């Protein structure tokens with residue numbers, strides 16, 4: 001699945017991978033035992049691999065979700081290739097950045 | 109550190125399917141005999157078999173635990189097979205936060221204290237009431253001892269000959 005930035009400004013795109021609990025859960029969710037996600041931009045050259053360990057439950061879950069981002073320049077394309085464990089984008093974000101600040105911590 | 113206490117979490121004698129007393133080298137000599145790091149164990153195959161390890165540990169203590177483990181990057185496939193039988197190996201470590209899967213790394217390397225193999229060590233803080241889950245079919249330098257810590261503040265390391 002390719003996507004071309006036909007917009008006029010930069011795009012913040014987010015995707016993720018699912019690190020499952022065991023080979024039994026891998027097969028149940030995605031069939032293919034050995035899997036990958038590749039992501040490709042004019043700069044990005046990424047190939048993720050799900051990571052089976054056994055883990056403490058957090059909100060009932062021992063599986064983990066690991067998320068990744070990138071800025072997609074105007075007129076560049078992003079190319080996803082995955083045979084499993086892919087948390088795919090539906091929405092992305094247009095950004096123009098003319099300056100910086102920080103994050104404030106406040107209860108107000 | 110405000111409190112520090114070495115404790116046993118995986119007793120050396122509880123490795124009934126592997127060999128915990130052969131994990132020794134002349135790079136770490138002690139009393140003219142060969143030895144090793146005392147707080148971790150260099151597990152080696154037992155009767156030509158390294159059965160997949162599955163070892164959990166629950167932090168039943170009241171404070172945080174500093175746990176240390178490691179992996180052995182060997183020299184060649186011939187040394188891999190000799191030490192751990194299984195040709196292709198891994199170590200997985202799992203906490204409520206940690207999601208780690210290590211893989212031994214064969215290159216050929218200059219000798220340092222006689223050794224071309226390398227030992228790569230990893231750590232984590234194990235919260236009270238969390239558990240750490242090890243899974244390894246080879247190359248695992250397992251913990252025996254870990255450390256209790258409470259941290260109420262920070263400083264730095266000083267360099268001094270005094």
Ligand SMILES: *[C@@H]1O[C@H](CO[C@@H]2O[C@@H](C)[C@@H](O)[C@@H](O)[C@@H]2O)[C@@H](O[C@@H]2O[C@H](CO)[C@@H](O[C@@H]3O[C@H](CO)[C@@H](O)[C@H](O)[C@@H]3O)[C@H](O)[C@H]2NC(C)=O)[C@H](O)[C@H]1NC(C)=O
Nearest residue numbers: 002003004005006007040041042073074075076077078079
């Ligand atoms: C992302 O997409 C842009 C725009 O793509 C164009 O419009 C889309 C809706 C689709 O219809 C696309 O098929 C179509 O190309 C790509 O930029 C465009 O590239 C094309 C060539 O691939 C350019 O056409 C050229 O036009 C010149 C003369 O103007 C000729 O000399 C060439 O022979 C060729 O026909 C087109 O001008 C260009 N458009 C813009 C606005 O840049 C873009 O390449 C693509 N992403 C990637 C990774 O390439």
Ligand SMILES: *[C@@H]1O[C@H](CO[C@@H]2O[C@@H](C)[C@@H](O)[C@@H](O)[C@@H]2O)[C@@H](O[C@@H]2O[C@H](CO)[C@@H](O[C@@H]3O[C@H](CO)[C@@H](O)[C@H](O)[C@@H]3O)[C@H](O)[C@H]2NC(C)=O)[C@H](O)[C@H]1NC(C)=O
Nearest residue numbers: 055056057058165166167168169203204236237238239240
């Ligand atoms: C790490 O271990 C603690 C404590 O484990 C308990 O004591 C050990 C020596 C063993 O005997 C364990 O089998 C035993 O569970 C775990 O926390 C404990 O979890 C259990 C449930 O797994 C809690 O029991 C519950 O009790 C409530 C009422 O109090 C019931 O409603 C539930 O049905 C259930 O029975 C227990 O309270 C809890 N104890 C403490 C002090 O937290 C801990 O979960 C474990 N590590 C991980 C990763 O879970």
Ligand SMILES: *[C@@H]1O[C@H](CO)[C@@H](O)[C@H](O)[C@H]1NC(C)=O
Nearest residue numbers: 125153154155156157158193
């Ligand atoms: C080692 O394994 C072999 C083959 O599985 C077995 O026959 C033998 O009894 C084992 N060694 C000892 C000392 O029992």
